[PDB]
Every structure is written in C-alpha cells, then in structure tokens.
Design a protein around this ligand. Structure first.
Ligand SMILES: CCCCCCCCCCCCCCCCCC(=O)OC[C@H](COP(=O)([O-])OCC(O)COP(=O)([O-])OC[C@@H](COC(=O)CCCCCCCCCCCCCCCCC)OC(=O)CCCCCCCCCCCCCCCCC)OC(=O)CCCCCCCCCCCCCCCCC
Ligand SMILES: CCCCCCCCCCCCCCCCCC(=O)OC[C@H](COP(=O)([O-])OCC(O)COP(=O)([O-])OC[C@@H](COC(=O)CCCCCCCCCCCCCCCCC)OC(=O)CCCCCCCCCCCCCCCCC)OC(=O)CCCCCCCCCCCCCCCCC
Ligand SMILES: CCCCCCCCCCCCCCCCC[C@@H](O)O[C@H](CO[C@H](O)CCCCCCCCCCCCCCC)COP(=O)(O)OCC[N+](C)(C)C
Ligand SMILES: CCCCCCCCCCCCCCCCC[C@@H](O)O[C@H](CO[C@H](O)CCCCCCCCCCCCCCC)COP(=O)(O)OCC[N+](C)(C)C
Ligand SMILES: CCCCCCCC/C=C\CCCCCCCC(=O)O[C@H](COC(=O)CCCCCCC/C=C/CCCCCCCC)COP(=O)(O)OCCN
Ligand SMILES: CCCCCCCCCCCC(=O)SCCNC(=O)CCNC(=O)[C@H](O)C(C)(C)COP(=O)(O)O
Lengths: 459, 104, 178, 69, 56, 88
C-alpha cells in the first residue's frame, strides 16, 4: 500500500523544487499517474480483504473511495489554477501542498486497520481543509464558516475518542479484523446507550445528519472551488465509511437506537430537498442537495441490510462525482459574472452551447436518471427501505419528485429563457473548463457498465 | 481624508483571449499553456481513461463468480441424481452441536 | 412598447381601451365576419350614445358599469395574435437572438470569413465611440436638476449629433434572427 | 438576399471536441486492434481437468488471455 | 547539453522512483508475515522437488 | 419557402388599400400624409377601428399606447416597417 502513499508524499518536494511556471503541469501529471496506480486496488476478493500489512488493508468498500480520492486531485488542480493566477509562487505551492496533504491523509484514513489510527487521520483531515477555506476563500464569511466547520466536527468526535480508548480497555484491541471476528452483542443498558451514541454522533455530523447540517451550507459556499469539491466528494463520505466500519460492534443495540436518526433522515430529506426550491444562491442550492442525498446513505446504513449497504456505497461514489461536477459548473459562471445569485446570469445556453450540454448531463445524473449509478444506489436503498417498512415508499417517492424539480429548475433558471442584456463579458468556454467537465462525467457513465466495482463488500 | 487608508483600486479581470486568441485557458504564457493542455489531455483521456478502463474491464475473476457457478452446477448435478434435497435447511451438522440440557 | 408611459391614463384613453378590448372579445364570440360586423356596429352605437356627456361623475359611473359588464361577459378564451404576449408564438425566436457583442469574441479564423462585414462593424464601433460624450452632454444639459420626470428621450438637436442612448435600440438583433 | 447570422464563437467548442476525440482515439484505436488481434489469434483457454501430480500456477485459473496476463 | 535538460527536469523522477521504492517496501513487509506460509489447513501442500517457498 | 421579403412599398400599398376600403374616407381625397383628424374629420373612436383593421390586415397586434399616436398612413407604414425590420 506504500506504493501509493510514497508517490503521494513525493508530490511535496516535487512541487517545492519545480519552476515558477511548471508547478501545475508537474502536479497534474503525477497525480494522474497516482490515480493510474490506484486503479490496481479494484482487484478485490470475494471473501476477505487485501491485508497488506499490520497497518494498512484494502476492502471492496475502501477501494472505490481510494480511487475517487486519487482521481479528484488532478481535477482540483485544474479547477484551481485559473483563480490563483495573480497569486505569488510560494502561496501557489502552499495551496498545492494543502491539497497534497489532504490527499495523503484521506488515503491513509481509508486504509487504516486500527480504529484509533483511523480516528487520528480522520481528524487530521481538518487542518488542511480549514486552512484552505479560511485563507483562500473570497468573502468575509469564510472565517465564520471555518469556525462552524471546525467545532461541529470536533464536538462530535471528541466523545468518539473517549469511546474508542474505552473499547480497547475492555476488548483488548481496536484492530478491525479482531473487532469483527470477536464481536459480541451490546446489552440494553444506559451505559451501552451512551457508548452507542459516542460511536455514532461523530460520523453523523460528518454526513451530515439533518439537524446538525448547518456547518455545511456555510463551509461549502464560502470555500474556494477545490475546497468545495473535496468537501462534497470525499470528506462527506468519511462519515459513511466510518459508520459502515463501526456498526459491527453496535448490534443488537442499533435496532432501537436508530429510530430518531431514521426519522430525522427521512424527514430532512424532504426538508432540504424543498429548501432547494427557494434558494437564491446557486452554490447554496448545490450544497443543500448534498444533505438531501446523504440522508439516504444514513438511512441505508442504519437499517443494516446487504441491499442497503450496496446502495449506500454506490450512492456515495455517484454523489461524489456529480456534486463535484456541479460545483465546477457553477464556478465557471462565477468566474464570469462574480456573483453566486442564480437569476443574475440567464439564457446562457444561447451564449455557451456546450457548457449547457454539460449542465444538462450533470442535472440528469443529479435526479438519478436510469441507468446511472446514482439511480442504482437510490433504488437499492429504496428497495431495502421498503423491506424495512412499506410506508417508507411515500417519503422516498416524495423525495424523488422534489429532487427532479429543483434540478431542472436549476437548469431552466441558468440556461434557458433570455440572457440578461447588461452583461457583456461572457467569454467562450476554455478548453480547461470543458476538459474538467468531461473528466467528471465520463467516469460516471463508464461506471454503469461495471457497477460491481462500486457496490462494496456485500456484492 | 474620508478614506480610512491608502489602498489599491480593485483591478479588473484579465481576458486570456486578448493576447492569446487560441488560449486554452491554462496559462498566460502561450507555450506553457499549450503544453498544459497537451499533458492534461494525454494523461487524462489517453492514459487513465482508456487504458485504465481497459485494465479494469479485463481484471481476473478473484471474486470467484465463475468458480461458484461451477461448484453450484456440480452439487446440483450430484444431488439430483442421488435424489437428495437440492439445498439443506441447516448449514452446520446437528451431530457436532451440543444444545443445552433440556427444554426447561 | 416604444412610447414612454405617462403617469396615468386619461378618461378618453380608458374608454378607448375598453372599446378596443370589447370589440376584440366580441369578435372572439362572433366568429363569422357578417355577424361580427352587425354586432360591432351595435357596439359602436352603444358607445356613441354617450359620446358627448359632460358630467364627469356620470361618465365615470357609466365607464365603471361598462367595465363590470365586460368582465362578466368576456370570452374565457379570447383570440390572441400568434406573436402577442398570450399567443402561441410569443417568445418563440428569443433563443435565436444573440447580442452583437458576442462577435467581439470570435476567433480570428472566424473573422477571416466575412471581412467586409467586420470592416463595416469597425466603422459602426468607431461611430459609437466618437459620439458618446456629446450624447452624455446633451442629456445632462436638457434634463432638470431634480431628474427626468419621464422616460422620454430627446432627439439630436445639432447637425452631426446622434440621438442620445441609441446604440442598443439601433443594434437590436432581429425579429427573425435565424 | 443572404444576411449575416450573429452567433457566439463556435470555434472553441469545436476545437475542444476534436481535441478530446483525437486524444481518446490515439490510444483507443490501438487498444481495440490489440484486443481483437489477441481474441482472433490467441483465443480463450479451454476448461480441462488438472493432471495428476501437477500444481497449476495462479494465473492458470482464468480463461481470458488478457486477464491471465 | 545534458545539464540543460536534467537540471530543470529531475523533479520528474521523484514520483516514479517514489513508486518503485514503495513497491520495494511492500515486499520487505511481506517478509515479516511468513509464519504460516505453506501452513494453512486450506493451502498446505507438498513442495515441488525444486521450489523452496510457496510464495515470496 | 415562407412569406416573401415584404418591402416598404408593399406596406404602403396595403395600408392605402385598407383605408380606401373604409366607407368614412373617400379614395380621391386620401393621401399618404393625410391626418386622420384634421384632414379627414375623424373621431377618436373611429381611429381605433382603423388601427384594428391594420392589425387584421398585417396579422399582428399594435399596443394601445403605440396605436393612439398613429394619425397618418405614413406613420402606420413606418411603425410596421420598424416592427418587421423593413429597410427597403
Ligand atoms: C440509446 C442511445 C444509443 C447510443 C449509441 C452510442 C452512443 C454513445 C454515447 C455515450 C455518451 C457520450 C458522453 C456524454 C457527453 C457527450 C459529449 C458531447 O458534448 O457531445 C457533443 C457532440 C457534438 O455535438 P455539438 O453539435 O458540438 O453539440 C453542441 C451542443 O452541445 C448541443 O448538444 P446536444 O443538444 O446534441 O446535446 C447532446 C445530446 C447527447 O448528450 C448526452 O446526453 C450524453 C449523456 C446522456 C445522458 C446520460 C446521463 C443520464 C443518466 C443515464 C446515464 C446512462 C449511461 C449509459 C452508459 C454510458 C457509457 C459511456 O443530448 C441529448 O441527445 C439528450 C440526452 C438525454 C438522453 C436521454 C436518454 C437517456 C437514456 C438512454 C438509454 C441509456 C442506456 C442505453 C442502453 C439501454 C438498453 C439497450 O454530440 C454528439 O456527438 C452526440 C452526443 C451523444 C448522444 C448520446 C445520447 C444517448 C446516450 C446513451 C448512453 C450511452 C449508451 C451507449 C451504449 C449503447 C446504448
Ligand atoms: C469518439 C470519441 C468519444 C468517446 C466516447 C466516450 C468513451 C470514453 C473512453 C472509454 C474507453 C473504453 C474502455 C472500454 C474497454 C472494454 C473493451 C471490452 O471489454 O471488450 C468487450 C467485448 C469483447 O469481449 P471479449 O471478452 O474480449 O471476447 C470474448 C471472446 O473470447 C472473443 O470472441 P471471438 O474470439 O469468437 O471473436 C471476436 C473477435 C473477432 O471478431 C470477428 O472477426 C467476427 C466478426 C463476424 C462478422 C461476420 C461477417 C464478416 C465477414 C464475412 C465475409 C468474409 C468471408 C466471405 C468473403 C466473401 C464476401 C461475401 O472480435 C473481437 O474480439 C471484438 C473486438 C473488441 C473491440 C472493443 C472496442 C472497445 C476498445 C476500447 C477502446 C475504445 C475507444 C474508442 C475507439 C474505438 C475504435 C474502434 O467487446 C465488444 O465490443 C463486444 C460487443 C459485441 C455486441 C454486439 C452487439 C449486440 C447488440 C445488443 C444491443 C441492442 C440494443 C440496442 C443498443 C445498440 C447500441 C450499440
Ligand atoms: C437536532 C439533531 C440532534 C441529534 C439527535 C440525537 C437523538 C438522541 C436520542 C437518543 C435515542 C434514545 C435514548 C435512550 C433510549 C430510550 C429513552 C427514553 O425515552 O425511553 C424510555 C427511558 O425511560 C425513561 O423515559 C428515562 C428517560 C427520561 C429522561 C431523559 C430525557 C429525554 C428527553 C429528550 C431530550 C432531547 C435529546 C437531545 C438533547 C440535545 C424507555 O423506557 P424504560 O423501560 O424505562 O428504559 C429502558 C432503557 N434501559 C434499557 C436502558 C433501561
Ligand atoms: C462525441 C460523439 C458521441 C457518440 C459517438 C461515440 C461512438 C460509440 C462509443 C461508445 C460505446 C458504447 C458502449 C457499449 C458497451 C460495450 C462496452 C462493454 O462491452 O464493456 C464493458 C466493460 O466496461 C468496463 O468493465 C468498465 C470500465 C471501468 C471504468 C473505470 C474508469 C477509469 C478510472 C477513472 C477514475 C474515476 C474514479 C472512479 C471511482 C470508483 C463490459 O463489461 P464486462 O461484462 O465485464 O465485459 C465482458 C468481457 N470481459 C469480462 C472479458 C472484459
Ligand atoms: C455536533 C454535536 C454532536 C454531539 C455529540 C455528543 C454526544 C456523544 C454521546 C455521549 C458522549 C459521552 C459518552 C461516554 C463514552 C462511552 C463509554 C462508556 O461506555 O462509558 C459508560 C459511561 O457513560 C457515561 O458516563 C456517559 C454519561 C454522559 C456524560 C457526559 C454527558 C454528555 C451529554 C449527554 C447527552 C448528550 C448525548 C446526545 C446528544 C446528541 C447531540 C446533540 C459506561 O462505562 P462504566 O462506567 O464502566 O459502566 C460499566 C461499569 N459501571
Ligand atoms: C363581449 C363584450 C362584453 C360587453 C362589454 C360592456 C361595455 C359597456 C357598453 C356601453 C359602453 C358605455 O357605457 S360608454 C362609457 C360611459 N361614459 C362616457 O362615455 C363619457 C363621455 N365620453 C367622452 O366624452 C369621450 O369623448 C369618448 C366617448 C370616449 C369619445 O372620445 P373621442 O371621440 O374624442 O375619441
């Protein structure tokens, strides 16, 4: 597994020893090659994981997450080099260093065998993200956003640490293989109830769960483009991965402790999806669609069935790709008109025909058009929820209807109608932006032909 | 002075097409910009997208799906000829199980 | 849509608009031309019956009762001209109207075709550049200190002058741009 | 008479599309030719019984030549 | 002339060799987890008359 | 194909044709520059009917604010030419 880690670490001295006008080229090429190397982890077994060493292992759940993480870095570098043009050389290298450190932390987080090491890396991912948001964000709110990002997460994860070192003191180990094999039921007691809460709330805040999702519309909106791309595509999935990993110790306590979270998720799906209908900020609309999509992953993980776990894995990957593409698409317009108001620039299909096609495809994948993997994950979760209770079809059905409404609305407001008369600085699309959209959308469509690669360990 | 400080005016954004009408939007320097475009296109579309997709398509069956199909065919053939049930209700043999003493 | 609106409509304007609207809805009800001619002459007679009323209270009351009559008796599906605001071709060609400033972003290979068109465009751009300060000066001098009372714009009063704020009216895309 | 049609600059979209097409084909066409040549001249393996006293290599458990490689 | 290329393009070999080194460090790791090599109840096997280990 | 490229002379011809078909206005007296009120002694109500007849002739609707002002056939021709983008 060091054959991926060490090349990623070499991106730092390579970036710092590069010419002033060659950092973007070198970083992009070598991060793409690291993605190529990362593709080898998709060769998974049917029975157990790829146990590289005592420290690192790879499973059918973490391999697609690793591939998405490595694939996202070149796209972030491509999306960042436009608005960082006037920046000094050393600050450009510092921004690229922040991105490389984030990738390194995420790669180790997804493959750590022991839960304390996983916790340390999963918390270390906060520092580069906060620095990115609060140093390179554009507005004065970016400071407050940073605080919201910092303290929502930590207030959730500080109990988790206390739980973890507690568990090792009673079971003897925090190794995930040992934890899974030597698993024992959780009794029905107040102490076990609070241990269950300490093991779960940290991940719930990362998803985030409706009710503790306030930090997200601030952090994603105020962040720079690469910050929001990594926040939506990978950092939200840390909660899903951690919940999937930690659920084994939780049973049979999860059957009754999951009710408040299932109610919050199944209602906040409707709440945030409807919030998207009345949103004057385009980037804020895209951010809220993420909460609406992750409510479904929370439901799938809480109900604890093989179909739900498969659906949650597929939906996490598909949402990562689609939300990253949507944030980039909004940034293309922002770098033209310098405002995130959705109705400021209209009728753009007339002026930018191919970027309109990109918008249409992104909106189609957002509303889970078959046979996209967005739809595969959504439908698997809906089927498992129907098994859990038939009445769920009403809530699930309603969410689907609303999701299509605010997606196409987002399409109709920005692309159709007539272009505003005063704006006259709308330049033709650059090759960089078009390629950035294509490198988002082509892997998404290609994953339809081999969905077993993104369906997790329950396939 | 009714201004609170000495400050630069906010500068207007630069159009890359003014000096490089075929600008690709990667860099101000035309040569560096063109090589950024070529390197992104080659290493993203030609290498990772095509060769990576081909590599993933032809991955060996380490998930043992064809193996499981073959084993299932073997046991279905064997059981049907024998007249034994196609599938067994209990995965683990009863003889090796020691239930508690009595039902009460 | 070309004339500036006024602060209000006078009584004469209101009754004329009512006459036109009632005639159009009557034509919607009376499909055939002879029947429309008959009842339109009856409508004109009904309007002429009080043509020279001098009691403005009585005239206003009569106009109000006429409005109440029309609203009850209006056709729920009035005929609309195809390109009128309610018609079936109202904004059909707006997707084809492209602003002329887009031509500035054409690649030089695109501009290599149509050399005469772009030479004429350069002359038009020079004309627009050269007369802007005179138009601004004219507007400032003509308008009152408080500000302009109405949206009416003045014509060019000197010889080599263009009417102020003319570029976007003149360079309208087209009604059938493609 | 023929009139001028005011359009946004279509040069850059067309250039991007032909660049993407070329850079995809540059490797895709050789890959397709290689795959079909391998298929035609080096077919899939044939399922056989393991000869007595022979331990197959791990790659000898797959039937497609590319997967075996 | 070799310096005009090498002195400004050597940063292009950091990640490749960093990959190669990484692979090496994996193999050495595999040499510390051989306590059950050819000892599992599922894959225990008589060695071929020339081979020394079932895997490296 | 579609409708021919309608020209200025055609607009003038159709406007004068419609006016000459109006019983209130005699054909010999009517001129392109004739005012509908001073020259023809026509009331405001009468004027509205002419505008509606022009709408029916050319198949498009003239807004009331725009319509009231048109007092000469030349004015109507110029308005129609401006709407249809007629330059000869
Ligand atoms: C069934 C179809 C058979 C297809 C045969 C093979 C075709 C392979 C194409 C694969 C997709 C290409 C990638 C998409 C990005 C395109 C890049 C681009 O910009 O091109 C511009 C290029 C140049 O045009 P231009 O003049 O420069 O354009 C200027 C403007 O942009 C103006 O541009 P525009 O207005 O022309 O817009 C582009 C155009 C087309 O652009 C797109 O929409 C591309 C994306 C399609 C929607 C995907 C998102 C929705 C979620 C479903 C995802 C399915 C993925 C399937 C697997 C894909 C694997 C790659 O828009 C549309 O036509 C409407 C799109 C909505 C499609 C509705 C039907 C959806 C379901 C179809 C069935 C899917 C499963 C089939 C198998 C079922 C069992 C047999 O145009 C083209 O070359 C044509 C585009 C391709 C259209 C294909 C539409 C069907 C695609 C079906 C999925 C693939 C199936 C392949 C296996 C056989 C089935
Ligand atoms: C354009 C830019 C925009 C980009 C768009 C976005 C894309 C982004 C980039 C993505 C990169 C792609 C990566 C994917 C790689 C995956 C490749 C792969 O896995 O290959 C699998 C597959 C090969 O499977 P395999 O496991 O390798 O072979 C197994 C056997 O052992 C082998 O069987 P065999 O040994 O018995 O013989 C088979 C052999 C031999 O074939 C033959 O010779 C037999 C032909 C019989 C013809 C019979 C008459 C002809 C001759 C008669 C006359 C001669 C004699 C008489 C002379 C006198 C004349 C009268 O042929 C082959 O091996 C097939 C060649 C494979 C080509 C694969 C194409 C993808 C390459 C990857 C790169 C693509 C990049 C684009 C560039 C593409 C360049 C082309 O490739 C296929 O394409 C199979 C498709 C066959 C299906 C037929 C159609 C079925 C219709 C059902 C659907 C109907 C519903 C409506 C929907 C219709 C929509 C179409
Ligand atoms: C906005 C987003 C916030 C995040 C949402 C987190 C939700 C956390 C909710 C925790 C789920 C359940 C907690 C404990 C399980 C039962 C709680 C209680 O209501 O049920 C009865 C509990 O009995 C009594 O009701 C005691 C609880 C009453 C005192 C607690 C106050 C709860 C009020 C709600 C506070 C708001 C929670 C969030 C704070 C910010 C069960 O009856 P009983 O048979 O006797 O007890 C069996 C439990 N045993 C086995 C451990 C013994
Ligand atoms: C511009 C104009 C557009 C229209 C014109 C284009 C012309 C048509 C071209 C489009 C082709 C249509 C596709 C038709 C389907 C045929 C392809 C199919 O056969 O290949 C699949 C194979 O597809 C691959 O399995 C999926 C590729 C995996 C995608 C990975 C993306 C690369 C990595 C990028 C990083 C992104 C991060 C992802 C996070 C997880 C079949 O899978 P499989 O049933 O097995 O094959 C059986 C035989 N085998 C097993 C021996 C090989
Ligand atoms: C962004 C906001 C997120 C908020 C997350 C905070 C909630 C975390 C859940 C509680 C955290 C503390 C739990 C302690 C760790 C559990 C380990 C454990 O098992 O210890 C228990 C002890 O459990 C406790 O003592 C916990 C009691 C609570 C102490 C601190 C109170 C915190 C507030 C409680 C309610 C809030 C929790 C839900 C709020 C959700 C977020 C709004 C039993 O051990 P023993 O003593 O050995 O018993 C067996 C032998 N006698
Ligand atoms: C299907 C249709 C539904 C039915 C609609 C019902 C409508 C009511 C029918 C009867 C109409 C009335 O009451 S009529 C309105 C009642 N009041 C008056 O008429 C006041 C006097 N009007 C004038 O003095 C003006 O000069 C003027 C007459 C406008 C001419 O102006 P010109 O000559 O200077 O253009």
């Amino acid at each position: 597994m060091l054959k991926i880690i060490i090349p990623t670490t070499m991106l730092l001295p390579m970036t710092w020893m590069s010419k002033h006008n060659m950092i973007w080229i070198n970083a992009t090429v070598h991060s793409l090659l690291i993605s190529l190397i990362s593709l080898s982890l998709l060769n998974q077994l049917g029975e157990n994981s790829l146990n590289f060493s005592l420290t690192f292992f790879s499973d059918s759940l973490s391999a697609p997450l690793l591939v998405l993480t490595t694939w996202l870095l070149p796209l972030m570098l491509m999306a960042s080099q436009s608005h960082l043009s006037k920046e000094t050389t050393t600050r450009k290298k510092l921004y690229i260093t922040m991105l490389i450190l984030l990738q390194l932390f995420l790669i180790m987080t997804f493959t750590a065998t022991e839960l304390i090491l996983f916790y340390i890396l999963f918390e270390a991912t906060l520092v580069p993200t906060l620095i990115i948001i609060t140093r390179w964000g554009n507005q004065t709110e970016r400071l407050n956003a940073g605080l919201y990002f910092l303290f929502y997460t930590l207030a959730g994860s500080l109990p988790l640490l206390v739980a973890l070192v507690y568990i090792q003191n009673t079971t003897g180990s925090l190794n995930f293989l040992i934890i899974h094999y030597w698993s024992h039921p959780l009794s029905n007691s107040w102490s076990n109830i609070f241990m269950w809460l300490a093991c779960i709330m940290a991940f719930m805040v990362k998803m985030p769960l409706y009710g503790l999702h306030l930090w997200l519309p601030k952090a994603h909106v105020e962040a720079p483009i690469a910050g929001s791309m990594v926040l939506a595509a990978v950092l939200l999935k840390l909660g899903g991965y951690g919940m999937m990993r930690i659920t084994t110790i939780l049973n049979p306590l999860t059957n009754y402790m999951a009710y408040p979270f299932l109610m919050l998720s199944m209602w906040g799906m409707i709440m945030t999806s409807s919030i998207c209908l009345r949103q004057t900020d385009l980037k804020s609309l895209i951010a809220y669609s993420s909460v609406s999509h992750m409510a479904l992953v929370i439901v799938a993980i809480m109900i604890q069935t093989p179909w739900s776990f498969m659906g949650a894995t597929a939906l996490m990957i598909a949402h990562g790709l689609t939300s990253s593409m949507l944030f980039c698409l909004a940034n293309t317009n922002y770098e033209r008109v310098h405002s995130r108001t959705m109705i400021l620039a209209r009728g753009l299909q007339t002026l930018l025909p191919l970027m309109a096609t990109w918008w249409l495809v992104a909106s189609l994948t957002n509303l889970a058009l078959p046979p996209s993997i967005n739809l595969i994950g959504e439908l698997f979760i809906i089927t498992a929820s129907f098994s859990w209770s038939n009445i769920t079809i009403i809530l699930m059905g309603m969410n689907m209807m609303i999701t299509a409404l605010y997606s196409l609305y987002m399409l109709i407001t920005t692309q159709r109608g007539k272009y505003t008369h005063h704006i006259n600085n709308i330049k033709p699309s650059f090759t960089r932006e078009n390629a950035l959209m294509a490198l988002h959308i082509l892997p998404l469509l290609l994953l339809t032909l081999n969905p077993k690669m993104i369906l997790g360990p329950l396939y | 002075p009714t201004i609170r400080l000495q400050e630069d005016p906010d500068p207007e954004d630069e159009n890359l097409y003014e000096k490089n009408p075929d600008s690709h939007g990667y860099d101000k320097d035309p040569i560096v910009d063109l090589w950024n475009m070529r390197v992104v296109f080659f290493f993203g579309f030609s290498i990772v997208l095509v060769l990576g997709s081909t590599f993933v398509a032809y991955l060996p069956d380490y998930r043992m799906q064809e193996w499981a199909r073959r084993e299932a065919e073997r046991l279905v053939k064997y059981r049907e000829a024998n007249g034994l049930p196609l599938m067994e209700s209990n995965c683990f043999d009863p003889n090796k199980i020691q239930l508690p003493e009595d039902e009460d | 849509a070309f004339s500036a609106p006024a602060a209000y409509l006078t009584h004469q304007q209101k009754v004329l608009r009512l006459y036109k609207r009632a005639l159009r809805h009557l034509e919607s009800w009376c499909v055939h031309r002879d029947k429309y001619r008959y009842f339109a002459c009856l409508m004109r007679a009904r309007f002429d019956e009080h043509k020279n009323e001098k009691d403005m209270v009585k005239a206003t009351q009569l106009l109000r009762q006429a409005e109440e009559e029309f609203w009850y008796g209006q056709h729920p599906q009035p005929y609309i001209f195809p390109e009128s605001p309610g018609g079936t071709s109202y904004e059909r060609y707006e997707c084809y109207k492209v602003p002329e400033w887009c031509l500035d972003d054409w690649h030089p290979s695109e501009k290599a075709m149509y050399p005469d068109y772009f030479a004429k465009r350069e002359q038009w751009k020079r004309l627009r550049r050269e007369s802007w300060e005179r138009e601004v000066k004219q507007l400032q001098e003509e308008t009152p200190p408080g500000g302009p009372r109405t949206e009416a714009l003045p014509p060019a009063r000197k010889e080599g002058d263009l009417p102020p704020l003319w570029w976007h009216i003149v360079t309208r895309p087209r009604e059938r741009p493609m | 008479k023929r009139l001028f049609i005011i359009k946004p600059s279509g040069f850059y979209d067309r250039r991007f599309l032909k660049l993407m097409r070329f850079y995809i084909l540059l490797t895709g066409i050789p890959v397709a030719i290689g795959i079909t040549l391998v298929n035609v001249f080096i077919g899939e393996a044939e399922l056989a019984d393991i000869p007595e006293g022979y331990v197959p290599e791990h790659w000898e458990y797959f039937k497609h030549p590319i997967s075996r490689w | 002339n070799v310096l005009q290329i090498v002195r400004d393009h050597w940063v292009h070999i950091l990640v490749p060799v960093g990959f190669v080194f990484g692979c090496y460090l994996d193999r050495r790791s595999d040499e510390k987890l051989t306590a059950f090599r050819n000892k599992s109840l599922l894959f225990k096997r008589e060695l071929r008359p020339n081979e020394e280990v079932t895997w490296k | 194909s579609d409708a021919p490229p309608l020209t200025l002379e055609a607009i003038k011809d159709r406007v004068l044709y419609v006016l000459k078909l109006y019983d209130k206005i005699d054909p010999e007296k009517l001129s392109v520059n004739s005012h509908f009120m001073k020259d023809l002694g026509l009331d405001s109500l009468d004027q509205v009917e002419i505008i509606m007849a022009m709408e029916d002739e050319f198949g498009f609707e003239i807004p009331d604010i725009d319509a009231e002002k048109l007092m000469c056939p030349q004015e109507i021709v110029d308005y129609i030419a401006d709407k249809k983008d007629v330059y000869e």
